[PDB]
Structures are given as structure tokens and as C-alpha cells.
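This follows on from our talk about sequence and fold. I would like you to pick a protein and set down its sequence and fold. Go ahead and set the record down below:
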Amino acid sequence: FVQHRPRDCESINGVCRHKDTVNCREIFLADCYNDGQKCCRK
């Protein structure tokens, strides 16, 4: 089974970087998996 988790980042064709990267555009739609990372336009 699984939990109640919306959408990640990889499930959208994105990347998982640091929420404090720099210029790695974040995807306010795709989530990460580390809890501390965010989505980026690859």
C-alpha cells in the first residue's frame, strides 16, 4: 500500500534539488521525497 501523498517531482519529469539551490527553478507543483528538497526544471 501507500500513503496520502499528492504529486512528487520525478512523477512529473522533474528533478529533486535543495529548496535553497539558487537558479534551479522550482516546481510549485511537483514534490520531492527527501522532505527537505524541492522540484526543479531539470
Observations:
- The chain is about 0% helix and 20% strand.
- The first strand starts at residue 15 and ends at 18.
